[PDB]
Structures are given as structure tokens and as C-alpha cells.
Amino acid sequence: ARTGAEYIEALKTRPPNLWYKGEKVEDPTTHPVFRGIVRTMAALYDLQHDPRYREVLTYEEEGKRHGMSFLIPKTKEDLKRRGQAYKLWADQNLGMMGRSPDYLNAVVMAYAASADYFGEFAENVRNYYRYLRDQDLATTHALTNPQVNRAPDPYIPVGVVKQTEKGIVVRGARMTATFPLADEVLIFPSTLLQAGSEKYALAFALPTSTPGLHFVCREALVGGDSPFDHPLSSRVEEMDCLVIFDDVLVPWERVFILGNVELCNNAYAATGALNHMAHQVVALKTAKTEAFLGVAALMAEGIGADVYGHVQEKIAEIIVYLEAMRAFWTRAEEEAKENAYGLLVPDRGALDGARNLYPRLYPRIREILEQIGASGLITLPSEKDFKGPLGPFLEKFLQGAALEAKERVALFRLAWDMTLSGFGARQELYERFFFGDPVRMYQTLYNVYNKEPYKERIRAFLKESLKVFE
Template sequence: MLRTGAQYRDSLKDGRQVWINGERVKDVTTHAAFKPIVDIRARIYDMAHEAKHKETMSYRDAATGQENCIGYKLPHTQEDWHAKRRSIDAVMREIKGYAVRVGDETVGEMWSLYDGRDILNEVDPQFSKNITHHIQHVLDSDTFHVSANTDPKGDRSKRPQDQDPDMLLHLVKETDKGIIVRGAKYETAAAYANQAFVKPTIANWGDDKLSDYALGFICDMGSPGLKHICRTGFTGRASADDYPLSNRCDEVDTLLVFDDVLIPWENVLFYRHTRAAAFIRGTLHRYSAYPFTLRLLYIADLMLGAAAFNAKQTGLDAQQAVREKLALLMQYRESINAHLTAAIAMAQPSPGGLLMPNQSLLYTGRYAAINQLPAMMHLARELCGGQICVTPDKATFEHPEIKEWMQKYYSVNEFWQAEDRRKLLAFARDLLNSDRAGHMVTFELFAQSPPFAHLNSIYMNFDMSNALSYVKDCAGLSDRVMDQWKKK
């Protein structure tokens, strides 16, 4: 099925417990902190029903005959990935900004578990059936699916069981209906999503085969006992005319508190089995890293476009020094594009029979995009100049007693009059200098795992055999040295 925006809004009115700024939220669809981003998600749903976007946003399933969301389609061909990229492009242009958590980027984590069905079968064949069921359920219901990973963790010098055990989500007890869990997770967009794939962050289980912390399950965001405690939002702090991105595209982050929440057995994807937990941690971003990295391409475009407009309006783009800085932003943008394009051009079959982006190219591209982001933002600030931090707000531009001075000093030529220049500077300020801009850098740095985990993904997925074989032959080494590497 394809949901409508109205159906999505109705699905959020389930009695969920949400708090923000010290208040209990009665309705996330109308609350000032959530309404703009809920409207964006509703708009994405509605796009799939419109003639202009329908072909880009949806496909007809050959088996069921029903129309489904293209972002949730299991990838079997390169065209499947190209179609996903076209839909993301349509969304980003429609919302006139960028949003990271809109559903398509986290459903891929379940595809990784789909690839590990043999491991799930070792625990209980029912869990393998559950993941297959839930992948189909996302398609059938067009639900807004997110992912809960990070725990509060507490004192990391101690084991979870040597401190308050609730610092990491854990099993409390089993019942005939399912498992009872307690603890907490951080998750972006949880307060206005329908369900989350919840899994552990522990990477090293040692020799333990079973652990009460090795849990993976689907949780309904309106479940009894689940509390959403949200960070203060950026929406409404200042005028939308002066901070357009903060007021339009703020994705609210949530501390999810599981206060003895029942997870039905049909929603349990793995349970106490550390091998399954280790598998999903090692392959979590096998698919989802693609849309996450693609989001960074749009951030690069926004920085490049804002900087280029600012240089062009005053004629600075004719100077070699300015062109060199713009070229660095272009290089950053195109390096992301190249890795994404190559990852699909050299896509690999997955263990579960899907087509996954080339893992080495995808992970190296992701790391380069995230690692260079702060430097590229600073470069864009240089090109935009000091006026993004000194320009007054819109109310000042419109005040009758000083309006003529604002028009005089902010109009550049016949192409750039004061109002367009004010809008550009306000947009660039929000993109590069605002509280939201700083939040975005930190979010991108850790939202997909911290940098050391990115580098480990590169190490684990890079095929060293070609370089080693080349050096072996050039240096005249014996075959024994290659045998040692293969045993590693």
C-alpha cells in the first residue's frame, strides 16, 4: 500500500508519551516543535499519490500487484538502487532543504539481518521468519520505520552488570506473550515515527554465547511503558525568515525510555544470542550507509550553491583565489558522488541474495564525506564572508524608518536586490553558523557510528589480496607470506 499524509498523521495519535521542554506533548502532529518535520514526512507520503512524483516515489510489486514505496523495496538490481536515488532527489528538492531520518535510510538495517537468516535459524527458526515478515510488513503498511542504536551507557570502565543495569537495554523476563525489556536508547525521529528496529551497541561480547543485552526487536513507538524524552528543538527559536532550515527541517532527537515494555514474540528478531548481535553490528550499515552518505551529497550541494551565489553576486568568482576555494567544494561534492556511483556500478551480491553496494567503496566514501565535512563548512563560511554573521533580521529590513538604508547597502546590482541578498545570507547563516548547523556536524559525525567504527568498516571490507599479491611478486616473496595473511 501507499499511505497518505493524513493516514500518517492519524497513526501518530496513539497515546504515545512524549515530553519536550519540560512539557507533556498532547499531539505531535500539531505541537510547534514537531509539526514542521511531521509535515515533511506527510508530504513525502503524499508525493507518491501525485502524478508528478508517483513514478519516482513508488513501484508496483510483481508478486502482490500492489503499489509500494520505492525506498522500502528490497534491492536486487542496480536499477533498484538508481530508483532509490531518484526518489531521494525528488524528496530533497521538494522539502527545500535536507532531512536525514525519513524512513528509507534505516529499513536497510533489517535487510542486513535478512542476510543473516542462517544465523537466526541457529537460535530459533521463528526469528528468521520474523525478519522476513517484518520486511514485508514495512512494504505492506508503508510505515515510518526508524532505528534505535545508542544507549546512555553509563560508566564505560565498568561492565553493564557491575553498575545500574538499565544503562544498557536488557531483558527483564520472558512471558507467554513476549519479552519484557528495560533500559534506554537514543533515536532521532522516534517521537513521530511508527516503529523502530532496536539493537545493541556492544561490539565485543568476548566468549559469552548468551547475554541479556543481546536483543534485537521491532518496537511500536506507542507501546505502553515507552517514554519519549526529546531534546529542545530549533523550531520557533527565531523567525523562519531568518532561520529557514531550523524552522523547516529540524529532526528531533529522543531518549527512549523502556520502562518494562512488552515486545511480542513475533517482533523479536534475535534474543540473547551474541553471535546474532555481533553479526548485525558488523553488517548494520551494509545497505543503510548508501542513503546516509547520499544525504551528505545534498549538504555539499547546499554549501556549494550558497558559496557560489555569494561569490557571483559581487563578482568575486572572477578571482583565481575564489575559484580555487569553490573548486575544493566541487571536489568534495564530486568525491561523494563518485563513491556512490561506483558503489552501485560495482555492486556485490549479498549472502541473502540481494544486491548490496560495493562495501569497500561505500565505506571509504562515507568516511571521506563525514571526515571532510567540518573543513568544507569552514571553506563555505570563508566564501560567504563575514556578512552571514553581521546581517540584521528581516524585521529590520522592513522597518519603515530604516528600510531605505537596508535597501541601499544590501542591493548589489540589477540582479541582486536587498531582499534576495538578505534571503541568501539568512539561508547561509542557518546552514553554516546556527545552532542547527553545529548540531548537524556532530550528528553526522556520530549518527552512523563514530569515526573509529567507520575506519574499522573500511578495514574489514577492503580486499587486500591484490596489493599483497602485487608486493609479493615485485619483492620476490615466497607463497608462505600470503598463507599467513589468509590465516589472519
């Protein structure tokens, strides 16, 4: 298990090929746009060494101690242990961090347990997993193919340029990678692959510092460094990037899938990576929802709005959604079964329910906070104003029905950062699409779900109807 210092040191030593507004970022650990998330990720690693949480966040094996997200679960109890670790880590940042390492570690763990799926590349997969686990490295993954203005370069989407004796050379780009402050980047199956697209049907991993690999940043959403003024954006801004592959060399040892269309398309499901990564997500969203509930309750109480029935109802609505997610989480673990490779995977029915329902619930939970805070959310002064000449006046005029001025503004700055700041609004779009387009996700659910039992019950029930004709 790695410490925060080791993580920071590694990033400083071999920084990702990050670009911010046309310029290379030489040291993300100190750059104003990235130092916040770097310190936050480091704290997650440090927590693994806190005596209070050591047993929750790590497990001992043959003299070594590894992060819980690497644990290949053999029993439901193990599954529960993985869940508690997902939850503890998520709670540190109120469920705002969407690409913490444990999400992808769950994917690689599943890939490794189901390694046979990869055929000749099986050993590569098992060894990559051992590497990530032993070094306790942080990963990120690049998704989505770009479009081409059709109003003939074969390397727009990431593709194999040539295969040598040392590996493959890839060229192209992935539209987005969240949290590039990782040691590694996964280029796994993303956009559905059509027949004949073997040149793009590949899966591999690379150090984020690889020559020819470029991460181009979007506008920074860090509001500032003050925790009072920007309680969340000052520390949990993960960043999103365009990922460019300029004739990047991928060593054979890092190739997991090569030129196999169907293998790529079925990878996540077959290996159980889908199940485990969705397991991390449901625990993460439960944490996120608990945070919104807490803020909503404190806001209502703080301004005396809790006496209003409709406010009580909005808060109760959040409680209902929280219980829904907890329920999906419980059933996912309790109904877990082993897959074709012997890997115990949490129930897909329950996890599909959670990841397809939350994208609809989140915008409403966000709306609820907006409706409770109302106009009190857009005219919040800075800590600098409290510290300034007018400080006395602010303490006299910014009080809440049950809160002093500094307390009220601090709480409202948080509610604001959770919803209306650039950071807060991004969280909304992210929840709506992080697992994919709801339109495609729902069509996928429709096709995979076994509807036969319900259809049969109705046909049986209809026998009596058709009998009137005999």
C-alpha cells in the same frame, strides 16, 4: 503508499511518548517544536502521489503501490531505482534530513531478504517488513548504551528482565534516537557486544506509543516559523532523544534476535543492511553537497566575490568533493554483487569509502561557506525589520554587489542556517558521528579490508631485493 494526511492523522491519534522539558507532548503535529518536521515528513509522503514523481518514488505490485525504499532489488537497474528515490527525497530538504524513513526501510528490506539469517525469528522479520511496507510507516532507531559512574543495577543498557509466554520485558535505555516523530522505533545492534552479554544481545521493534517507552528531547533547535528568517530549522529539525524503557513489553512477534551475541554483532553486515543503508547515505550526502555548492556559488556571485581566484578555488573544491561522492555512488551500484542470501548489495568498498571520507569533507565544506560569507553571515536582520519602520534603510544598505537587499539577506539567512545556527552546527557534529566514531570506523575498515593483494605485489617486487644475496 501512504499520504501525508494519513501520516499526520496516525501521529495525532497515537502520538509517541515524547517529553519536552519535563512535560509530555500531547500533539506533536501542532506543537511549535515538532510541527515543522511533521509537515516536512508529510510532504515526502505526498510526493509519492505526485504524477511527476510517482514512478520514481513507488512501484506497483499485485495491485498495490509501495514506497521504493521497500523494493528488494533483483538487478542493478533496481538498485539504481532505489538510488533515484533516495536522491529525489533528499533533494526536497537539501540533504539536511538525516533520518528520513527510507534509510531504515533499506535496513528492514535487507533484513527481510536475508531473513534466514535470523533463524527461528526469520518469519517475524519477513512479516515486520511486510507490515512496514504495506502501511508505509516511518521508523526511527535508538542507539548507544549509557555509562555508569564507577567512581549493581544490571539494566542500565537495554536488557531482558524476564521472558513470558507473551513476549519479553526489557528495561534500560538507549542514549539517542533521531526523528522520534515516527510510527515505529527499531532497537537493533548498536554498541559492540562482548562475550557473556547475551542479556543485551537482542533486536526488536515497537510502536513509538508503547507503554513504558519514553523519548526525552534535547534543546529544540527550531529558530522560528518564518522561512525567510529560518529557511531550514523551521522545517527540517528532526530532534534527538534519550530513549527510556521502563519495563516495556515486547511481543514475541516483534523479536528478531534474542540472547545471541555474535548474531547481533554481524547482523548489519551479513544481511546487507549495512550496504543498503550506506547506499541511501551516499545519495543523501551527494544531495547535501549539491546544496552547499549552489549556496556557495550564489553567495560568491551575489557579493561579487566570484571574481577572486581563491573564492573560485574554494567553490571548485566543493565541486571536487561532489564528484567524489557521485563516483562512490556510481561504483557502489555498478560493482554490486549478491550476498550469501541471494540479496544484491551495492559494493561495500565504495560505500565504506564514501561514509569514511564524508565525515572529513563536510566540516571543510561548511568552513568554505563560512569563508565566502564571512562577516556577512552574523549581522543578518529579520524579515520583520524589512517590514518595519526602517525597511527603506535596509533596502538601501543591505544590498549585494549583484543582489537587492531582501534577496541577499534571504540567501545569507540560508547559508547561516546551514552552518552557524544551532541547527546548522548540529548538522556538523551529526556528519562527524552519525555512522559512528571515525576512530572506530577506521579501525573497522582496516580489519575488514582485504590487504593481501597489495601486500603480495610488494613481496613480489621485493624478491629482486633479496636476490642480491644469492
